Design a protein around this ligand. Structure first.
Ligand SMILES: [Fe+3]
Length: 312
């Protein structure tokens, strides 16, 4: 018996978690790890001829792309329905959350007054003029953040916040979260918005000594309440090994499985905050209760309003 996993968790960190499932169950895990959008495009092309059993994807926006494209089948599981929090799964049971990431504020306290920064709304302060730096609108992470704001405040109010935010940007858009962390730490940027786990990875020397030194210069602010995003798993629509795909998903969503995946990328497990000493130092967070499904709903409108105010 075997199971074929196509995973968009492209961090090169998760192989060990699949090995523990194999040893306990005797089910062979064939594992492909690449870009999420390459997986979606390949699967649309293959249809019934695909060898995918279980699909793992990063971000609300990519999960919505896969759902729109009809890539998942509904599954029934007492374990999953009674263990994965409602806000972090498909109401129609086609996909399930496995890890939690926060998109946070990073600041250089030698360049800006950090006592003035608590939440996203503060980044429109005119005293931050020229000092705010962003990754481009092509990042699903950024699209899902603007989608978060539309969910709570509606389109009108979100556009006001975006006109204010983009006003304070005077630097070209970055193509990644790690290069924006380097700019904030070097001090060419005073304020950035990035995923918390990139700061943890650089602090722990994963990207070498220079990136570690730059990351020490940064003060990380968790908005209160906090915007939460996820990685998720679902069973492929035409999975051959359906039974084995459900067993592996039940394992990855469990306390052992969710801690295993999360501890590799410095994320939070599903039902508890990270044990990790670097992540714990960032502080406690309270979720804002916007569902992952809602983040997918408002993705199209988020892209249109980012384009309209000039977030490029
Ligand atoms: Fe990432």
């Amino acid at each position: 018996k075997e199971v074929k996993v196509y995973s968009g968790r492209h961090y090169n960190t998760d192989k060990e978690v699949y090995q523990k499932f194999q040893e306990q169950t005797g089910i062979k895990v064939r594992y492909i790890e690449t870009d999420g959008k390459a997986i979606i495009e390949r699967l649309k092309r293959e249809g019934k001829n695909s060898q995918a059993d279980l699909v793992i994807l990063v971000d609300a926006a990519i999960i919505e792309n896969a759902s729109k494209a009809n890539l998942f089948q509904k599954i029934n599981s007492n374990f999953l329905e009674n263990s994965v929090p409602n806000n972090l799964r498909d109401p129609r049971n086609k996909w399930f959350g496995l890890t939690r990431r926060l998109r946070v504020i990073i600041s250089n306290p030698d360049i800006v007054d950090i006592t003035k920064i608590k939440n996203f709304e503060d980044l429109t302060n005119p005293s931050f003029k020229g000092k705010v730096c962003l990754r481009n609108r092509k990042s699903p992470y950024n699209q899902s953040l603007v989608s978060n704001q539309i969910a709570k405040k509606g389109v009108g109010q979100t556009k006001i916040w975006l006109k204010g935010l983009i006003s304070n940007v005077s630097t070209p858009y970055f193509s990644g979260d790690s290069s924006l962390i380097r700019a904030v730490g070097l001090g060419t940027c005073g304020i950035g918005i990035v995923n918390h786990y990139y700061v943890a990875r650089m602090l722990d020397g994963v990207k070498g000594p220079r990136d570690a030194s730059l990351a020490e210069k940064i003060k990380l602010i968790i908005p209160n309440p906090a915007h939460v995003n996820i990685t998720a798993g679902g069973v492929y629509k035409y999975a051959e090994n359906k039974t084995e795909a459900i067993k592996l998903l039940e394992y990855l969503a469990s306390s052992e499985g969710s801690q295993g995946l999360a501890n590799k990328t410095y994320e939070h497990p599903l039902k508890e905050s990270s044990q990790n000493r670097i992540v714990s130092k960032f502080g406690d967070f309270t979720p804002d209760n916007v569902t992952i499904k809602e983040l997918g709903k408002f993705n199209s409108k988020a892209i249109e309003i980012m384009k309209e105010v000039g977030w490029n």
